[PDB]
Write a protein that binds this ligand. Structure first.
Ligand SMILES: Nc1ncnc2c1ncn2[C@@H]1O[C@H](COP(=O)(O)OP(=O)(O)NP(=O)(O)O)[C@@H](O)[C@H]1O
Ligand SMILES: Nc1ncnc2c1ncn2[C@@H]1O[C@H](COP(=O)(O)OP(=O)(O)NP(=O)(O)O)[C@@H](O)[C@H]1O
Ligand SMILES: [Zn+2]
Length: 291
């Protein structure tokens, strides 16, 4: 059964409860759909002087089928250090990633190869599956949630939090995820799923390997109709293995889709035959680009 766990308090093991005065603002790091991400310096305590990313929201819960803010820990997912409530606001204190998003870094190259993209898709795959084993769904995978750390390893900026903006105008017109990355059944309002994450994952693969989105129209409605019904040519410049992974991810019906039976069939796919998943998880594999 899908249970919604409200997020109101969090302290990482070994530390003490935080409040807004313990953090000083340095400079904004970016803006999402749920607000702004600020760079902050911890003022006092054991971790005084340490830098963190900070998110300001209204409310934030976590839906889980069937500790949880500690279980979501993973080599390729951002760590939440603190969460607290004050004056109608929820503050999230996070790991501050210094590398920027993957798309920016890729745009800084004239060209790149399937192998580079393969590094990113592999780490990402491990992150997704990790959340799915905990009964969590990422829901809204997008390029803006995929950052680089200092070394050039992947970090997701979230782990499926159901969030609510504090800006009253932005909260007013908020609904679901980013349509360009939605699986057909999500578009058809049948609900988010692990399988839908793997569709999103496929769309990110296509976009990374072609520089283009597979379905986009002149507006919301047209984009949706394309997702459901439009044609999609196979990029002929891709290897047979890449063509095969793409072909197996892009099934409009879930449980027909690769990954809807775990990530093992994804890890075993000919496209990742090159990858030592144990070394990958241990961050012993060398990133294609330094940030
Ligand atoms: N921990 C972090 N460290 C550094 N930069 C971050 C961090 N989290 C977010 N950002 C930046 O801030 C922007 C917002 O990221 P995101 O976490 O997606 O915001 P959001 O509103 O929570 N979700 P979305 O609505 O999908 O944007 C991104 O473009 C990131 O580059
Ligand atoms: N962890 C999960 N496991 C399985 N199904 C989930 C999970 N989380 C959400 N769902 C499904 O996604 C739906 C939640 O979306 P709902 O609140 O009905 O409107 P929504 O706007 O699509 N949600 P959101 O995208 O978070 O704003 C439910 O009907 C669930 O079946
Ligand atoms: Zn939704």
């Amino acid at each position: 059964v899908v249970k919604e766990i409200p997020i109101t308090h969090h302290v990482k093991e070994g530390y003490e409860k935080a409040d807004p005065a313990q953090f000083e603002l340095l400079k904004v790091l970016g803006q999402g759909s749920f607000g702004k991400v600020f760079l902050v310096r911890k003022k006092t305590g054991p971790d005084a002087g340490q830098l963190y990313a900070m998110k300001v929201l209204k409310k934030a819960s976590l839906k889980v089928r069937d500790d949880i803010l500690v279980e979501v820990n993973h080599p390729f997912i951002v760590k939440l250090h603190y969460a607290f409530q004050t004056e109608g606001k929820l503050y999230l204190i996070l790991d501050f990633l210094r590398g920027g998003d993957v798309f920016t870094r890729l745009s800084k190259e004239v060209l790149f190869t399937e192998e580079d993209v393969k590094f990113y898709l592999a780490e990402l795959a491990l992150a997704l599956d990790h959340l799915h084993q905990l009964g969590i769904v990422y829901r809204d995978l997008k390029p803006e949630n995929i950052l680089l750390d200092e070394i050039g390893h992947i970090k997701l900026t979230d782990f499926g939090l159901s969030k609510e903006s504090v800006d009253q105008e932005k909260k007013a017109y908020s609904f679901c995820g980013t349509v360009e990355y939605m699986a057909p059944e999500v578009v058809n309002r049948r609900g988010h799923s692990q399988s839908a994450d793997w569709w999103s994952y496929g769309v990110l693969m296509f976009e990374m390997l072609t520089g283009t989105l597979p379905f986009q129209g002149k507006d919301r409605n047209e984009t949706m109709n394309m997702i459901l019904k439009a044609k999609l040519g196979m990029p002929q410049f891709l290897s047979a293995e890449a063509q095969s992974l793409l072909r197996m991810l892009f099934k409009r019906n879930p449980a027909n889709r690769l990954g809807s039976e775990g990530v093992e069939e994804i890890k075993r796919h000919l496209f990742f035959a090159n990858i030592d998943w144990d070394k990958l998880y241990k961050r012993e594999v060398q990133p294609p680009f330094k940030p």
